[PDB]
Design a binder for this molecule. Structure first.
Ligand SMILES: [Mg+2]
Ligand SMILES: [Mg+2]
Length: 755
C-alpha cells in the first residue's frame, strides 16, 4: 500500500476503508494464496494476526504511519483470524472490525456453512441492521432448504408476509432485506413446507425474544448497544492458566435467587420494562433484571469471596420448570430478566469485581415446542430423522443431528457466540453421557450400534472435540467443564491425547461418597472410612471439579442441613466439616445458592431463596464461615497451585476408621506454604491426638471450623502448637493436637516464630 492511501485513512478522507482495511487477496500460487490484513489501530504501538485454528501468530508491521499495520500471510484460505493490539502495557484480542463489507451472505459464507466451518455464521444468519442499495434496514436470513416458501411476518406488516416473501439462495438459505425497520422490530418466519402446510417459527439465530410464553424474535443492533470496560480482565484470563488458580464457583439459577415486587416496573440499564410475573400462583412476585442482579448478586458474591458465578442455562427457554435445560432460543439471553445489553452489563460488572462467569450450555437436545427448531422446514432438519438416535423418548425431547454440517455449525458457532458477544469465561455441559452413547436410556432392540458395532455416538464425540478445540484456540484460559456419569476416559484431557477436550470434570463419585458419608450417623462412619478416601485413587485420571450442585437439594434429597444427623448444633457442624474438607481436598470448588447460609427447605425454582433466615445468628455464622473459607482459599497457594500434581497432596494418616479421623498435607512451590489438614468426623472431641508433620517448628492454627464465630464450641489449639521431635506416621516430627468435635483444622508452619 501507498502513503497517500494510508494518509486518506488516517485523516478520514477515504471513500470506503473496506477497500484497504481487513483481509485482501494479493495473488494465487499453485497450492496457496498470498493475503494481506490491514488495520488502522490508533494509540496501538504493535499488533499481530492470530490464526488460532492453525496455531499461528504473525506480527503486523507499521506502514507509512505508526498506527497503520500490514501483515502478509501465505495460506490457502484466511477465514479464521483475530487481531492482537498492544496500547502501552495492555493487549486486547478482537475480531477484525473490517471483516464484512456487506450484511448479505457471500458465496464464501454459504460454502463455509455447507462444510459446517463458519465460526461466525451468526453475523449473517438471523436478523442484522445494515445498508443494501443505499438504504438502512434489516437483513433476514434463515436455513430452511426443504421449505416451499418463507416470509418475514412482524409488527411492520401486521403479520401479513405477502410483500415480504424471501429469496432462496443455493437451494438452502432464504434471505430478505427490509428497508427502514431497525432494532426493536418484532418478527417471525412464516414457512410453507413441501406438503403446503403453513406455520410460524421463532428465528433460530434470533438475538432477543418476547417474554415467555410469547415467542416472537426481536431485532438487536448487537454490536451498538453496550460499551465494555473489561479489557484488563480479558488480558489477564488469556495470559493465565485457570487450572493453577483458585476456582470457587457460586452456582445460581437467575430466576429463583431473589424476586422483586410485581407492583413496580423492572428497572433496566438506562430504561425500564413491564414486570415479569414469576407465575400465576405467586403473582405479587417478579423476576429481577440482569441489571438489578448486577447491583445485588455481584456485591453479594464478591463479599462471600467466590471467584466465579455459574449460571443455570440463560439461553431463551419457554418453561420455568425446565430450569433452562430445554432451550428453544440458543442465540438470545432469556427476556425474563431484560435485554441483551442488560446481560452484557452483568458480565462487565462481574469482570470489574474480579469475578468470572460460567454458562450452563445445552447442546445435547431441544424440546418439541412448535415455535423452536423441531421439524423446522417440514423435515428432520436440526434433529436426526431416526428416533433411535434423534429422540430422548424418556425426556420427550429431540437430539441434534451432530453429523449434519449446518447443525454442527449452529452449535459450534453458538458456543463461540457467548464468548464473542457476551465475554463469558466458561461453559459447563450437563449429562455429556446423553450425547456420547447411541444406547442412552434406550432398551435392547430400540437402538443401533455405530459403523464398528460399538455403542459410541461417533458424530457426537467428534462434535464435542471440535467445540473444545475451537473454544481454547479462540479463547485460551477459559473453563470447559463436563458432568459425565459413565466413567468415559480422558473427559478433561486434550483432544491430541484422545480426550474430549474439557479442562475440568465434575467428580460425581466424590459427591455421592461425601453426601452418603455425612448422611450416616457418626457412630457408623467407622464402617465407611472408604467414603472419605476412595476418590483419591482415581483422582489423577482427570482434572476434578468438586461440585455440590442444584441437583442434590431438590426432589426430596433435602438441603444440606437436612441431610445431616443429630441436633441443630451437629447438623451445622456436619456442614462446616464437609465444606472445610471439600475446600482442602484437591480439586476446584462448586456450590449452589442457599448452601452458604443453611437454607432448611429444598431449592424451589418457583420461588426465591429464604433470605429471612439471615435475620438469625446460626445462618449468619454459617455465611461468615463460607466468607472466611473463600478468603483462606484465595490466600493459601497450597489449596490451589498443585490440585492436579502428586506434589499437591499426601495423606499423613487415614487408617483411624474407629474415630473417623483423617489428615493430609497440601503443598505448593514454596515448602513454607505446606498445610496440615486434620479432620474429625464425629462429635467426640480429642484432648491429645498425635499427627506427624514434615518439619520442626510452631504450626499456626490457620483455620478451625469449630471456632465460635462459625457457630462452633470454640475447642482447639489456642493459636497453634510446637512440633515435638517424636517420629509419628513415618515423619520425623509430630503435633499433639486438640481435635474439636465434627470439625476440620488447617495448620501452617510459621518458620519465623520466637522459641
Ligand atoms: Mg396470514
Ligand atoms: Mg420468597
Amino acid at each position: 500500500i501507498s502513503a497517500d492511501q494510508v494518509n486518506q485513512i488516517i485523516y478520514n478522507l477515504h471513500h470506503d476503508p473496506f477497500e484497504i482495511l481487513g483481509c485482501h487477496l494479493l495473488e494465487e500460487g499453485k497450492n496457496t494464496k498470498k493475503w494481506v490484513v490491514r488495520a488502522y489501530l490508533p494509540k496501538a504501538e504493535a499488533a499481530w494476526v492470530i490464526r488460532p485454528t492453525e496455531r499461528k501468530e504473525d506480527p503486523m508491521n507499521s506502514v507509512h504511519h505508526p498506527n497503520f499495520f500490514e501483515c502478509i500471510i501465505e495460506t490457502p484460505e484466511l477465514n479464521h483470524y483475530q487481531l492482537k493490539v498492544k496500547e502501552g502495557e495492555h493487549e486486547k484480542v478482537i475480531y477484525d472490525p473490517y471483516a464484512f463489507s456487506s450484511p448479505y451472505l457471500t458465496d464464501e459464507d454459504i460454502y463455509l456453512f455447507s462444510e459446517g466451518n463458519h465460526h461466525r455464521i451468526y453475523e449473517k444468519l438471523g436478523a442484522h441492521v445494515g445498508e443494501i442499495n443505499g438504504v438502512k434496514g434489516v437483513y433476514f436470513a434463515v436455513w430452511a432448504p426443504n421449505a416451499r416458501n418463507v416470509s418475514v411476518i412482524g409488527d411492520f406488516n401486521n403479520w401479513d408476509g405477502r410483500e415480504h416473501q424471501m429469496r432462496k439462495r443455493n437451494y438452502t438459505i432464504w434471505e430478505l432485506f427490509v428497508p427502514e425497520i431497525g432494532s426493536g422490530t418484532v418478527y417471525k418466519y412464516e414457512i410453507k413446507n413441501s406438503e403446503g402446510h403453513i406455520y410460524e417459527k421463532s428465528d433460530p439465530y434470533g438475538f432477543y425474544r418476547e417474554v415467555r410464553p410469547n415467542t416472537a424474535s426481536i431485532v438487536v443492533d448487537i454490536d451498538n448497544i453496550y460499551q465494555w470496560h473489561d479489557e484488563e480482565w480479558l488480558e489477564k484470563r488469556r495470559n493465565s492458566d485457570p487450572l493453577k488458580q483458585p476456582v470457587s464457583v457460586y452456582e445460581v439459577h437467575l430466576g429463583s435467587w431473589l424476586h422483586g415486587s410485581s407492583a413496580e416496573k423492572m428497572p433496566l440499564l438506562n430504561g425500564e420494562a413491564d414486570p415479569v410475573i414469576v407465575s400465576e400462583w405467586n403473582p405479587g412476585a417478579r423476576f429481577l433484571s440482569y441489571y438489578e442482579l448486577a447491583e445485588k448478586l455481584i456485591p453479594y458474591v464478591k463479599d462471600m469471596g467466590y471467584t466465579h458465578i455459574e449460571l443455570l442455562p440463560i439461553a431463551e427457554h419457554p418453561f420455568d420448570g425446565s430450569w433452562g435445560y430445554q432451550v428453544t432460543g440458543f442465540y438470545s439471553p432469556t427476556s425474563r430478566f431484560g435485554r441483551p445489553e442488560d446481560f452484557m452489563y452483568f458480565v462487565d460488572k462481574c469482570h470489574e469485581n474480579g469475578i468470572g462467569v460460567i454458562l450452563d450450555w445445552v447442546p445435547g437436545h431441544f424440546p418439541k415446542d412448535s415455535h423452536g427448531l423441531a421439524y423446522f422446514d417440514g423435515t428432520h432438519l436440526y434433529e436426526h430423522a431416526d428416533p433411535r438416535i434423534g429422540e430422548h423418548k424418556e425426556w420427550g425431547t429431540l437430539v441434534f443431528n451432530y453429523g449434519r454440517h449446518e447443525v454442527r455449525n449452529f452449535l459450534v458457532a453458538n458456543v463461540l457466540f457467548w464468548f464473542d458477544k457476551y465475554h463469558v469465561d466458561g461453559i459447563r455441559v450437563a449429562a455429556v453421557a446423553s450425547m456420547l452413547y447411541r444406547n442412552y436410556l434406550r432398551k435392547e432392540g430400540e437402538w443401533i450400534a455405530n459403523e464398528y458395532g460399538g455403542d459410541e455416538h461417533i458424530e457426537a464425540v467428534s462434535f464435542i472435540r471440535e467445540v473444545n478445540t475451537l473454544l481454547f484456540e479462540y479463547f485460551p484460559g477459559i473453563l470447559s467443564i463436563a458432568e459425565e456419569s459413565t466413567e468415559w476416559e480422558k473427559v478433561s484431557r486434550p483432544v491430541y491425547d484422545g480426550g474430549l477436550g474439557f479442562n475440568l470434570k465434575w467428580d460425581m463419585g466424590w459427591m455421592h461418597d461425601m453426601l452418603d458419608y455425612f448422611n450416616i450417623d457418626p457412630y457408623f462412619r467407622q464402617y465407611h472410612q472408604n467414603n472419605v478416601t476412595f476418590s483419591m485413587l482415581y483422582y489423577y485420571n482427570e482434572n476434578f471439579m468438586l461440585a455440590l450442585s442444584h441437583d442434590e437439594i431438590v426432589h426430596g434429597k433435602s438441603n444440606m442441613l437436612g441431610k445431616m444427623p443429630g441436633d441443630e448444633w451437629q447438623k451445622y457442624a456436619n456442614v462446616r466439616a464437609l465444606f472445610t474438607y471439600m475446600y482442602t481436598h484437591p480439586g476446584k470448588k462448586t456450590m449452589f445458592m442457599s448452601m452458604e447460609f443453611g437454607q432448611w427447605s429444598e431449592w424451589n425454582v418457583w420461588g426465591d431463596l429464604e433470605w429471612h433466615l439471615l435475620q438469625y445468628e446460626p445462618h449468619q455464622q454459617l455465611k461468615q464461615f463460607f466468607t472466611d473459607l473463600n478468603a483462606l482459599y484465595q490466600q493459601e497457594p497450597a489449596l490451589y497451585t498443585h490440585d492436579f500434581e502428586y506434589h499437591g497432596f499426601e495423606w499423613i494418616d487415614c487408617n483411624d476408621n474407629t474415630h473417623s479421623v483423617v489428615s493430609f498435607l497440601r503443598r505448593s512451590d514454596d515448602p513454607n506454604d505446606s498445610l496440615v489438614v486434620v479432620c474429625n468426623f464425629t462429635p467426640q472431641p480429642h484432648s491429645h491426638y498425635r499427627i506427624g508433620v514434615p518439619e520442626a517448628g510452631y504450626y499456626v492454627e490457620l483455620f478451625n471450623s469449630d471456632a465460635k464465630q462459625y457457630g462452633g464450641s470454640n475447642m482447639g489449639n489456642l493459636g497453634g502448637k510446637w512440633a515435638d521431635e517424636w517420629s509419628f506416621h513415618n515423619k520425623p516430627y509430630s503435633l499433639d493436637l486438640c481435635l474439636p468435635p465434627l470439625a476440620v483444622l488447617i495448620l501452617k508452619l510459621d518458620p519465623t516464630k520466637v522459641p
